[PDB]
Amino acid sequence: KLHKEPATLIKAIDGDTLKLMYKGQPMTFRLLLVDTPETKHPKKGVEKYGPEASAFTKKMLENAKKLEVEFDKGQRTDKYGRGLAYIYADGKMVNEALVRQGLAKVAYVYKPNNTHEQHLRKSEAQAKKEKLNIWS
Questions:
Q1: φ, ψ for residue 103 (rounded to 5)?
Q2: Which residues sit in the known binding site?
Q3: What region, left, alpha or beta, does residue 50 occupy, with left being phi > 0 and alpha being psi -120 to 50 degrees?
Q4: Which residues are catalytic?
Q5: Helix ranges restricted to H, the chain
Q6: Binding-site residues for Ca(2+), please?
Q7: Contact, 56 vs 101, CB < 8 A?
Q8: CATH number of 1-136
């Protein structure tokens, strides 16, 4: 069973990557299972809805009473040293909220880090039925 642990916002970097204070140390975190559009593409630059996803994550985190991190069952860090987790803002999962608003796609899934995959796919299917942002 996954467990939530408290964390403190240091800095939101973009739609799906953030800097948090976690167990006394600053760490970069990457949101599990979702891809938001990039604002820092060396390539494209700012992709479409990149700034939008970015403002959403930022506001949601910055306005929360409480932030919590939830590690999945698999690897907790990627090859870049980023924590891989589900982030909660006052009990609401940031990763689902982004997908529900059409501001992110569900990622390519890598077991066994896939516990909330179906939940997220359900939210993505609704944002697509409602044609929000990305799906519009």
A1: -105, 10
A2: 16, 35-36
A3: alpha
A4: 30, 38, 82
A5: 50-62, 94-100, 117-129
A6: 16, 35-36
A7: yes
A8: 2.40.50.90
